[PDB]
Design a protein around this ligand. Structure first.
Ligand SMILES: COc1c(Cl)cccc1Nc1c(-c2ccncc2OC[C@@H]2CCCO2)[nH]c2c1C(=O)NCC2
Length: 311
């Protein structure tokens, strides 16, 4: 039962732009629901300007998959009807994971990387259980609540499969070619197993501390590269077992790829002996802010999408 809570514009103060890009504009603000005095840090999203129709579809997906215990997927708090339709969620104060890994490379140890991989797989497994194909899993669409806790976001491309359906077949909208499974590029078919491909690319992004995949290669060439058996390279920090997970995610046969339930288990195993699996210089000397740190409050200070050319 998908409900959308309407929040009045006047319950929001101190709205400030956080960032803009392909996702539209995201603002941060303070939500003070009338009836209470509690002040809740929020993020507020509106699309680029159709915009109204599209963003309600995202609200619907998010409301559809919401649940009492939902750690690793962003929850919709409500929507706001102003000059635009805006979505409202809890602020993730450390920002986008892609920016985070680029900015904090020198303090990101093996334990953090492996834990993030586990968390993203747990979030995706949750979505799979609710018949949701995300279709845009990428490091740009993972957010950082704390350095120890990430969440999947951006349901702009996401689709719910009916009880009889195994796949979603797309029409001609712009799609993230460099993160897509070959079958999605060739045939516009999307499944939970094409999300696994995207998961593999996401892991690659993290393990390279936010390198751009297939940098300098036009998206029009990607299907040909994949058909020749070429893949993203082994990141220097990754031991062979970690890279082999990525390579399994990029198998041609979708049903031969790992399932998210398997990825949780495999990455959890690695997270139990992190320095065995990732080799990072100075790993033991690295630290990131954690809620259990006495000074954690100090940290809380005040063309990837292309028109398809096949299928
Ligand atoms: C879709 O869930 C949201 C809702 Cl319901 C409302 C506002 C923001 C989001 N998510 C996003 C944030 C966001 C959510 C919560 N806290 C901070 C945030 O932005 C942090 C930085 C700022 C710009 C890049 O991310 N940032 C991004 C999304 C998104 O959908 N796509 C990519 C960039």
């Amino acid at each position: 039962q998908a409900l959308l809570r309407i929040l009045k514009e006047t319950e929001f103060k101190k709205i400030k732009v956080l960032g803009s890009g392909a996702f539209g504009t995201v603002y941060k603000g303070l939500w003070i629901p009338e009836g209470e005095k509690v002040k809740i840090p929020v993020a507020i999203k509106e699309l680029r300007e159709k915009a109204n129709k599209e963003i309600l579809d995202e609200a619907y997906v998010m409301a559809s998959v919401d649940s009492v215990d939902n750690p690793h997927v962003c929850r919709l708090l409500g929507i706001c009807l102003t000059s635009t339709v805006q979505l409202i969620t809890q602020l993730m104060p450390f920002g986008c994971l892609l920016d985070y890994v680029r900015e904090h490379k020198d303090n990101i140890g093996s334990q953090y990387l492996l834990n993030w991989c586990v968390q993203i797989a747990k979030g995706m497994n949750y979505l799979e259980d609710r018949r949701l194909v995300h279709r845009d899993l990428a490091a740009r669409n993972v957010l950082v609540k704390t350095p120890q806790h990430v969440k999947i976001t951006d349901f702009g491309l996401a689709k719910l499969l009916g009880a009889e359906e195994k796949e979603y077949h797309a029409e001609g909208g712009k799609v993230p070619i460099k993160w897509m499974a070959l079958e999605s590029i060739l045939h516009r078919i999307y499944t939970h197993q094409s999300d696994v491909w995207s998961y593999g690319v996401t892991v690659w992004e993290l393990m390279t501390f936010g390198s751009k995949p297939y940098d300098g290669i036009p998206a029009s060439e990607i299907s040909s590269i994949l058909e020749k058996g070429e893949r993203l390279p082994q990141p220097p920090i990754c031991t062979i077992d970690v890279y082999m997970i990525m390579r399994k995610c990029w198998m041609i046969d979708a049903d031969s790829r790992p399932k998210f339930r398997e990825l949780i288990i495999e990455f959890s195993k690695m997270a139990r002996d992190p320095q065995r699996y990732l080799v990072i210089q100075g790993d033991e000397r690295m630290h990131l802010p954690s809620p259990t740190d006495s000074n954690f409050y100090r940290a809380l200070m005040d063309d990837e999408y292309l028109i398809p050319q096949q299928g």
